[PDB]
Ligand binder design. Structure first.
Ligand SMILES: *[C@@H]1O[C@H](CO)[C@@H](O)[C@H](O)[C@H]1NC(C)=O
Ligand SMILES: *[C@@H]1O[C@H](CO)[C@@H](O)[C@H](O)[C@H]1NC(C)=O
Lengths: 49, 48
């Protein structure tokens, strides 16, 4: 059971989904989203063509 | 960004001497499906 939860929904291309990990670099992880170091959560992604 | 690359069996090593390594230039130029670093972290490549 969790005391607080957040969502953080967006849309990127399929080659950039790897950049939504904590210690990643790239166009998205540098200028767009930037997950933290001590994340404590799950990352969910799915094709939506 | 070259016309032809080498074959996997003739893989053509080349060296990169004095220059500044700024991977930012390729952000809209190319999209990388794999980028995995060993012995170094990708967030420290700017400070090395
Ligand atoms: C970058 O990519 C976009 C999308 O294709 C393009 O419109 C633009 O001309 C490219 N170059 C620069 C400098 O933004
Ligand atoms: C990459 O190669 C193409 C060849 O079609 C060229 O037009 C372009 O200027 C080169 N550089 C970049 C950053 O796309």
């Amino acid at each position: 059971c969790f005391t607080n939860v957040y969502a953080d929904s967006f849309v990127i291309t399929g080659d950039e989904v790897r950049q939504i990990a904590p210690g990643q670099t790239g166009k998205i992880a540098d200028y767009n989203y930037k997950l933290p170091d001590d994340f404590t959560g799950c990352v969910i992604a799915w094709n939506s063509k | 960004n070259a016309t032809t690359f080498a074959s996997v069996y003739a893989w053509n090593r080349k060296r990169i001497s004095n220059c500044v390594a700024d991977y930012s230039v390729l952000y809209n130029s190319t999209s990388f499906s794999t980028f995995k670093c060993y012995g170094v972290s990708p967030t420290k490549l700017n400070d090395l």
